[PDB]
Ligand binder design. Structure first.
Ligand SMILES: C[C@@H](NC(=O)c1ccc(C#Cc2cccc(F)c2)cn1)C(C)(C)O
Ligand SMILES: C[C@@H](NC(=O)c1ccc(C#Cc2cccc(F)c2)cn1)C(C)(C)O
Ligand SMILES: *[C@@H]1O[C@H](CO)[C@@H](O)[C@H](O)[C@H]1NC(C)=O
Ligand SMILES: *[C@@H]1O[C@H](CO)[C@@H](O)[C@H](O)[C@H]1NC(C)=O
Ligand SMILES: N[C@@H](Cn1oc(=O)[nH]c1=O)C(=O)O
Ligand SMILES: N[C@@H](Cn1oc(=O)[nH]c1=O)C(=O)O
Lengths: 780, 780
């Protein structure tokens, strides 16, 4: 059988403290537990044994009745604790009216499942998992500490404050670890946090298991540099030992939990691997009277604690010769100068144990007051202490704890509590310590980012991918966790609306500077100004000046003998054609509008006919004068009427041209098209079809052929300075110029400027080859 | 307080059967159980009570000693079962040497946690969770059924066989449901399957909880029509009741598990909502000798079963007034005419219970034979039966079960087993039943897809997205479950490398049909055929005919005064230049090849330059001999240069042209560029560049300018048939022929046909306007 601590009293209160370490992986079946514990063992045992004495001494609490205890060792194991609980309830098969629950959540659950069948309230001081908050399954369970829902919140707040996204999760196999990690995973995946992989491991696992776990952790080392540990102290210690073994000294950031807290026994010897790690600790002020009592304990006088001799020998490596527990393993003896003061560290969860004991005592006191207000002691209506009544009294009892605050239980049996954020840092040389760097209280996460990471240099944030949101590059997530993405540029034609997809502008638009919204690229027109249009306007102006000068000379030299052979009316039509051609370019080089491109077409059509048809009829006559004279045998042939015939021949040729232009205008009406050659640029012009520029042009070319043919007939006939010869050069040059612009026209969409220049050149060639004699011959 | 079945014996075997239903959500704390169960209760109790008597009667098994029992009710609850186990082990604090474990996995775990402390082996018949396979925590636990890993595999196989990807998961709160659903999730999400959402719910949850669960399930109804239920019978029944209540009668296909199997008590009354459900059932042949004992049981004679009278009154709604149990609740009495034969259904797992009891008996037999081979009975070395020895003997025992096969335990305490796939179908009008449609045995899923869905119009597949392998249209996953994707068509330019990306080919290439891969664009070279090149070569042939005709006429009249005006050798290299220019056409329009690639270049370089050189060297003399004649003061220097030096002064600068063209040539070898004008088409051309084409052209232009200047010097001069004027006009028109094609060349693609036309035009205009006149009347 196992040894237990005893204390006589009227009412007996059970206890389950992990005096010894958890059984090793190979000694589980034998249910033998390992070395003695100081913080979790002897300290808590002494704390209870002294708190009971304090309660007994106090008259204002539980008067006239003394409180006893039966403290048993759980060895931090479910199997051992269940055995001890069976020993507790053996009498029910002095009764145990209540127990101070074990530290572990899984162990607490196992013990509660047995205790609830006998109506024995259980108060825990460190059991934290959310699973114990279910009063349907755990009616007789209370704790003086909050659930680990708040702890998971605090951890999520920590990971979100430092912009850690691609973290890794490790938790101890059990109930505390499982519940904690589930809650953390939920609240982390909710906001924006992603887990590379979740790993689980027993505390008492071998070296090989921890090595494999750390290899798996390092499999994501370059990216996931922060590990979320909902792990016990032994799990963290095993991780540190693995880090030491395989040569990791600070490329992980361990985010601890309540299990780690500020325990010095999890980092002793392996400090350098755990430096920089952040842990969450339940806030509990150090108890002073407990220290005053504890630091004066000696093995010689302290008999009521059965494990104290073993602990004394284990702490100061020595053998106590005078007592049965010699443990001759240790070499040296224990001199009478060893004190517990040296290297004394009180456990963090010391206030909670005293608070739990006080809560049980106050519950009993309240129930005793409520049952028999008159009698001072154990009234007859209590001797069979009813578990249900005690539970009901405990669920509503309130008192002032050792810390100074008021302790009360909510509907779920929990108690209010706040957390302290501690960062493991190196103070000096070969001197590490836990430093308080923040707190968490009902949602607010106060922190001190100056103490943690002295320099802005903060542990490379656990990010699965660098921010791809810079410019045109777009985010594409693969068939993996939706926190890292491939960063790809989508073509500049497109713009990014969603971070994960981009679309292009329809036909005539472009993305803005920010690549959020098309900008409808500006339309380019012919634009008065620009070198080539200015040259066109200059040429048009000079041409118009020449035309008006020639017209002036003609309307001054009306009926001069020299100008009598040519048809005066027909020459008027010639000048009209030339002037209209010169006006056509002025109309054409401009902003396209309905009004402008209504009459640019009639210009380009009518002018080269209104001149060239009249030239045809003029040359025809001047040939008929000579061609008819070749025979000179007998010709009563006034077939063609001097001018009468010539003018109507004109007014029919020009009118058929006008008819064809009007038809081509009617069937194809002019609109202001916004033709899009490329996605880059947008132009606007009036709709021209192939027909609209090939039919009138073809007809004009036919007139060119007619004039040239007739000019070749007449060639070098003696005339007034041989004007027919001038017509010869006129038509030769006109045909050459017409043939010259074919490539540039049917090559570049430079339709407008080439058309303008062609019309101007054709006009100036006539205005030159003709009238040149008329300007200086008559000048003579 | 709770009743117990008894049977006297030397060795007592415990049992835990769920005789009554699970305590209701209100009465959990009072641990008062529900109504009686037939399949899971009385039938199993009677099975044990009869199989023990069969074993006792058998002389070849457990000889000379009797086997007793102590059957207790667990009410399918962990709290009640723990109390009953405490009652079991109270004697250890006649001992119970071992128990036949409870049906539920969680309940089995709770019972085992207590039993392993007292070395009491536990054999389960329906516990299936994987958690019980861990011998570290459950050393004294064995099962005659396989773990639920195989069950999860079977379910994954079922969902894989029917294209189901986007399913929803439900599991019962507990250990069986949790382990099953975790295993299923792992092996489903691993391979190809998707889960819309995983839901958990307690079996004894209220109507409201089931309503909320079904609302959440319907929230994904259009896409996820298959529900994977790793749920108990009561959970499935609750789901069916919810479906009936909110009028959901065929939307879902429930995929059951061992909990459902082919139980008629989970679908009775609510058949119409469960039709078309597929369930997995552990194969176990019906035990024939059990029926012949069970069907003859009557309440009057069966006194050894404490629950039999209550069950009799519950099954046939009647009050057995005669007996202590009357339960007035049932109005009518029962005549002595009701038999268990009517509506008799033996449960699926009757074979497993009998096999477990036989396993325990055979274990005891083997251990007895090993301990004392000589004595037949309870030898003195066996009075304190050791649990460890019994466990060791049980872990290696093998025997023949009721079915006929051999029952043995592996290292983990499990047993081999095969699964049977059952389908809930409507056979006839007002008739439903389970139909065996498949099996699963060590990864082999033999199904019959004809009995289920007797057509091709099966259940709408639980798929989130239709197969989007439609040509290009890639898949884009939107952060949620891979399963659900949008469809974007990817650009013609590019093709699909994988399902999730589309990349473009090289600078010159096209994706093949159905965008599968990539191909090479055929090179469409400038064919010897085609519309334009045939005209070009016709023109070249006519030009060459002109050259040979002119050369012939020159050879006919060599020393005639009408020809002997200038150096006849100059008007030999003129024709040489013309011929070479015409040959440039033939050496240009062809397949771009190494040889032709320099031939064309040397042609275009030398020929026009060398022709115009000789024209220059003729015209300077013909101008200067009369330029000096204009003044003629003395000018008695007939030589100057003149004489036959003309040929030398032409040839030196022709060699200069050859030198410069060789200079351009040495930089660029006659290779072929694969010019890419657009993404769609690929062309090939010679290695000519801007620098390699603009220098010889520029030099030739300089010669053109020089010759034009000299032609302007001469123009109209009286000589033999007036050569100068015609050649001057020829050069004038040539100057602008050289300029017409410039825009459509330097920046174009058809720069071969343009060259072909330009050289021919320049050749005809230079020949037809230089020699033609001289040879027009060459006859005279
Ligand atoms: C560019 C194109 N040219 C023309 O489409 C065109 C149209 C009209 C004229 C003219 C004229 C003219 C002539 C004399 C007097 C006058 F007022 C006007 C020239 N070219 C082609 C034929 C390819 O060269
Ligand atoms: C098409 C192109 N023209 C030429 O690159 C080119 C090169 C050579 C000639 C010639 C010639 C010729 C002239 C007389 C006799 C003879 F044998 C050959 C014309 N154009 C550009 C510059 C755009 O005008
Ligand atoms: C974390 O949050 C954002 C991430 O860019 C940034 O504004 C902030 O400075 C980061 N760092 C800290 C210490 O908050
Ligand atoms: C989907 O099911 C069909 C038959 O129901 C069959 O082609 C195969 O099992 C599945 N399809 C594929 C592509 O595997
Ligand atoms: N809340 C923790 C308590 N605790 O865990 C440890 O590892 N030490 C310790 O005190 C748990 O539920 O286990
Ligand atoms: N397979 C279940 C057992 N079981 O659940 C039911 O609903 N019926 C039944 O036999 C388990 O492993 O706990």
């Amino acid at each position: 059988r196992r040894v237990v601590a005893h204390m006589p009293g009227d009412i007996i209160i059970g206890a389950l403290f992990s005096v010894h370490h958890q059984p090793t992986v190979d000694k589980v079946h034998e249910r033998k537990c390992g070395a003695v514990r100081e913080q979790y063992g002897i300290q808590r045992v002494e704390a209870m044994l002294h708190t009971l004495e304090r309660i007994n001494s106090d008259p204002t609490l539980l008067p006239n009745i003394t409180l006893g205890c039966e403290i048993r060792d759980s060895c931090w194991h479910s199997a051992v604790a269940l055995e001890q609980s069976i020993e507790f309830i053996r009498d029910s098969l002095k009764p145990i009216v209540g127990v101070i629950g074990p530290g572990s959540s899984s162990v607490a659950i196992q013990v509660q499942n047995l205790l609830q069948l006998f109506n024995i309230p259980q108060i825990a001081y460190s059991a934290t998992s959310m699973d114990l908050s279910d009063k349907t399954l755990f009616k007789y369970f209370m704790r003086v500490v909050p659930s680990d829902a708040q702890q998971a919140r605090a951890m999520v707040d920590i990971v979100k404050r430092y912009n850690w996204t691609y973290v890794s999760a490790v938790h101890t196999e059990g109930n505390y670890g499982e519940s904690g990690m589930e809650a953390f995973k939920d609240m982390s995946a909710k906001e924006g946090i992603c887990i590379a992989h979740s790993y689980k491991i027993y505390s008492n696992a071998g070296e090989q298991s921890f090595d494999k776990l750390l290899k798996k952790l390092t499999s994501h080392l370059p990216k996931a540099r922060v590990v979320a540990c909902f792990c016990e102290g032994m799990t963290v210690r095993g991780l540190l030992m693995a880090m030491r073994r395989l040569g990791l000294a600070g490329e992980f950031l361990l985010l601890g939990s309540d299990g780690w807290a500020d325990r010095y026994d999890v980092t002793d010897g392996y400090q350098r691997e755990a430096v920089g790690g952040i842990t969450i600790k339940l806030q509990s002020p150090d108890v002073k009277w407990f220290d005053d009592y504890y630091l004066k304990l000696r093995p010689e006088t302290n008999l009521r604690n059965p494990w104290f001799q073993e602990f004394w020998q284990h702490r100061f490596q020595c053998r106590l010769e005078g007592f049965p527990q010699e443990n001759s393993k240790y070499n040296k003896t224990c001199n009478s100068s060893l004190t517990l003061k040296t290297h004394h560290v009180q456990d963090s969860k010391m206030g909670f144990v005293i608070n739990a004991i006080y809560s049980m005592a106050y519950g009993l006191h309240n129930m005793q007051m409520s049952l028999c207000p008159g009698y001072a002691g154990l009234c007859d209506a209590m001797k069979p202490i009813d578990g249900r009544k005690l539970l009901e009294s405990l669920m509503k009892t309130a008192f002032t704890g050792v810390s100074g605050d008021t302790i009360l239980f909510d509907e779920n049996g929990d108690s209010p509590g706040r957390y302290e954020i501690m960062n493991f840092k190196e103070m000096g040389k070969d001197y590490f310590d836990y430093i308080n760097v923040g707190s968490w209280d009902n949602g607010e996460l106060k922190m001190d980012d100056d103490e943690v990471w002295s320099k802005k240099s903060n542990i490379i944030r656990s990010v699965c991918s660098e921010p791809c949101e810079k410019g045109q590059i777009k985010v594409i997530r693969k068939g993996e966790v939706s926190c890292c993405w491939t960063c790809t540029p989508c073509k500049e034609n497109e713009y990014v609306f969603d971070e994960y997809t981009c679309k292009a502008c329809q036909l005539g638009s472009w993305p803005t500077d920010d690549l959020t919204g098309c900008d409808l690229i500006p339309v380019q027109y012919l634009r008065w100004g620009d070198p080539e249009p200015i040259a066109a306007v200059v040429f048009a102006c000079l041409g118009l000046l020449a035309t008006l000068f020639v017209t002036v000379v003609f309307i001054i030299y009306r009926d001069t003998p020299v100008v009598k052979s040519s048809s005066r009316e027909l020459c008027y039509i010639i000048l009209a054609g030339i002037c209209l051609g010169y006006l056509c370019t002025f109309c054409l080089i401009a902003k396209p509008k309905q009004i402008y491109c209504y009459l640019q077409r009639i210009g380009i059509g009518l002018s080269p006919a209104m001149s060239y048809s009249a030239l045809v009829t003029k040359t025809n006559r001047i040939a008929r004068i000579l061609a008819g004279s070749k025979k000179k045998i007998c010709t009563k042939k006034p077939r063609f009427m001097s001018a009468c015939a010539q003018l109507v021949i004109a007014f029919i040729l020009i009118c058929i041209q006008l008819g064809i232009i009007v038809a081509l205008f009617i069937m194809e009406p002019p609109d202001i098209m916004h033709d899009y050659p490329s996605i880059r640029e947008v132009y606007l012009i009036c709709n021209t079809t192939n027909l609209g520029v090939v039919a009138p042009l073809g007809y004009n070319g036919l007139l060119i052929l007619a004039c040239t043919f007739y000019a070749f007939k007449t060639r070098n006939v003696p005339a007034n300075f041989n004007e027919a010869k001038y017509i010869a050069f006129a038509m030769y040059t006109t045909c050459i110029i017409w043939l010259a612009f074919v490539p540039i026209y049917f090559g570049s969409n430079y339709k407008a400027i080439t058309m303008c220049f062609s019309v101007s050149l054709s006009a100036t060639v006539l205005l030159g080859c003709m009238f040149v004699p008329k300007v200086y011959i008559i000048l003579a």
